[PDB]
């Protein structure tokens, strides 16, 4: 699971040496930017369910042909799978937002997602429509903070550049 701590510890470990001053400056930076990260994590854990509803209802505000045949709209169950998968993605943005690297977001969500999505006929552009909605639905001074919002955008854009 990638973070600042694991990157610098793993680097000095592969080197063999004790942790010198450079690693100490790195973790110093982590506990500098910690406040903006945890602010965004607190507010995301605050109102996540409304982000679930507007997220998935925004995904079916776009492409309608999912609820058409036999692509995926064929039950309350597949639409529930739809929502809970989006909740897995937001819960990973919470996790990676707390950690401060793209670690748990990548190793739990992104790695090997592609084979599962081509295999189970899942379109990725539907998810990308959902996330581009949820990053367009921000607010600069009233929603989080100038620093927190930026960090949230970063995480979410990472998901988009991972999926497209």
């Amino acid at each position: 699971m990638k973070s600042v701590i694991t990157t610098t510890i793993s680097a000095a470990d592969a080197a063999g040496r004790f942790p010198s001053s450079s690693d100490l400056e790195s973790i110093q930076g982590n506990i500098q930017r910690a406040s903006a990260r945890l602010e965004a994590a607190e507010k995301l854990s605050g109102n996540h369910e409304a982000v679930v509803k507007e997220a998935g209802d925004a995904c079916f505000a776009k492409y309608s042909y999912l609820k058409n045949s036999g692509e995926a709209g064929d039950s309350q169950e597949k639409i529930n799978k739809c929502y809970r998968d989006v909740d897995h993605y937001m819960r990973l943005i919470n996790y990676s937002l707390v950690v401060g690297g793209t670690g748990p977001l990548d190793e739990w969500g992104i790695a090997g997602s592609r084979e599962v999505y081509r295999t189970l006929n899942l379109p990725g552009s539907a998810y990308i429509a959902s996330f581009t909605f949820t990053r367009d639905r921000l607010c600069v001074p009233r929603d989080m903070s100038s620093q927190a919002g930026v960090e949230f955008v970063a995480a979410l854009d990472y998901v988009i550049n991972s999926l497209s």
Partner: protein, 251 residues
């Protein structure tokens, strides 16, 4: 479920439930019961025979050397064993994954025979030491046959990067990334690597040519199936073909 209602199967559920959780080596469990030391001596017989096939005469070849200078072979052995314990260090799923790739590569390597398939599929360390010592004895490896023309050196550098992708998943380095485990043997691995690259020039030109065609045949048979453009790169460039490693390595 059906064991638990039986008086006897309440034993079986507890033994199986005790066994279930814990990780293990493929060396530990893949062989038949009581045949691990046979596998260690098996693999030792393999590597000793390839060491016989490298030097047919009493003169050691320029490549069959450990230390360039005094006090370097002791740093080569002290660097050599920490890699082995580090092979013991890693996680279980990685061990079985590296095991199955060792199996597939050993099977491509055999190019025939039941014993070759049966003994390499039965016996794990036989497969690992087989692949390493065989590709090692033909000269199909990274440290030898480095590129001459600048284009081939760049291509070899790109292959080296794309194997470094395997040897770091997700920013965090491997278990097996092992330049240190000491104070300052990483510089010794630099010294030994640079000097081995110097010693590949010292070989006979006969062994240079045999090394080239062996490199091409290696990268074809293991890693090229169809792959007409990769067939063309394995045609023309011996440095690209010389340095493709089974992802059991992660070196």
């Amino acid at each position: 479920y059906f064991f638990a209602q039986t008086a006897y199967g309440r034993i079986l559920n507890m033994v199986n439930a005790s066994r279930f959780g814990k990780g293990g080596d493929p060396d530990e469990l893949v062989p038949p019961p009581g045949a691990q030391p046979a596998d260690q001596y098996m693999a030792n017989c393999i590597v000793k025979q390839y060491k016989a096939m490298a030097t047919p005469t009493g003169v050691y070849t320029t490549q069959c050397t450990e230390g360039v200078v005094r006090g370097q072979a002791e740093e080569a052995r002290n660097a050599a064993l920490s890699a082995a314990f580090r092979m013991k260090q890693r996680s279980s799923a990685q061990k079985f994954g590296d095991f199955c790739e060792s199996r597939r590569m050993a099977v491509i390597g055999a190019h025939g025979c039941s014993y070759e398939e049966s003994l390499l599929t039965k016996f794990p360390a036989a497969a690992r030491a087989y692949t390493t010592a065989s590709s090692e004895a033909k000269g199909n490896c990274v440290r030898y046959a480095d590129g001459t023309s600048p284009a081939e050196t760049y291509m070899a550098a790109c292959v080296d990067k794309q194997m470094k992708f395997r040897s770091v998943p997700m920013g965090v380095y491997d278990v097996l990334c092992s330049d240190g485990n000491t104070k300052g043997v990483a510089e010794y691995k630099r010294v030994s690597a640079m000097s081995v690259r110097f010693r590949s020039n010292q070989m006979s030109t006969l062994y240079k040519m045999q090394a080239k065609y062996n490199n091409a045949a290696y990268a074809r048979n293991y890693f090229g199936h169809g792959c007409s453009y990769e067939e063309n790169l394995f045609n023309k460039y011996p440095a690209v073909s010389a340095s493709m490693r089974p992802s059991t390595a992660r070196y």
